[PDB]
């Protein structure tokens, strides 16, 4: 599923991401835009053989099991394929664990390079929330 901007904002708000660990909703929408272009089915392989999955590009090196990342962890206790669903619940619940692990949203490289320090409120402007 390719979400619209305001559609995704509303879904993320319903799932408790607005101001989660102090990160306003626009931060999460901005991260999803540049990680996946709002596409739940996005995948990208990393140099070390791990793979990033879904709307927030969660990495199999630490967070999910895909059966092909030897020596990795599965800290969200899910198959990585569950992060490609049109229902974003699994991605949101795993993202909550990630952002709580000490480094905040700096875990998302695209957030650090394209959202951090910008006017992220623009990403929810005009949306009925
Ligand atoms: Cl957009
Ligand atoms: Cl915001
Ligand atoms: Cl594995
Ligand atoms: Cl949902
Ligand atoms: Cl933080
Ligand atoms: Na893994």
- How many Å apart are CA 105 and CA 65, to the nearest integer? 22
Stated in angstroms to one decimal place, the resolution of this structure is 1.6
Experimental method: X-ray
Ligand 5 centroid – CA 82 distance (Å):
26
Q: Which residues is 20 bridged to in the sheet?
A: 23
Residue 101 marked as a ligand binder: yes
Q: How many residues does the chain have?
A: 129
- The CATH number of the structural domain formed by 5-124 is 1.10.530.10
Residue 94 φ/ψ, nearest 5 degrees: -70, -40
Q: Which residues, other chains included, contact 18 with Cβ-Cβ below 8 Å and sequence gap of 6+?
A: 12, 24, 25
52 is annotated as an active-site residue: yes
- How many Å apart are CA 9 and CA 17, to the nearest integer? 9
């Amino acid at each position: 599923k390719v979400f619209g901007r305001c559609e995704l904002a509303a879904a993320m708000k319903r799932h408790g991401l607005d101001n989660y660990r102090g990160y306003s909703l626009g931060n999460w929408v901005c991260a999803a835009k540049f990680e996946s272009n709002f596409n739940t089915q996005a995948t990208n392989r990393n140099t070390d053989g791990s793979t990033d999955y879904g709307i927030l590009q969660i990495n199999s090196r630490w967070w999910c099991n895909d059966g092909r990342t030897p020596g990795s962890r599965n800290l969200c206790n899910i198959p990585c394929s569950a992060l490609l669903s049109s229902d974003i619940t699994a991605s949101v619940n795993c993202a909550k664990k990630i952002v709580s692990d000490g480094n905040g949203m700096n875990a998302w490289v695209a957030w650090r390079n394209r959202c951090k320090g910008t006017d992220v409120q623009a990403w929810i402007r005009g949306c009925r929330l």
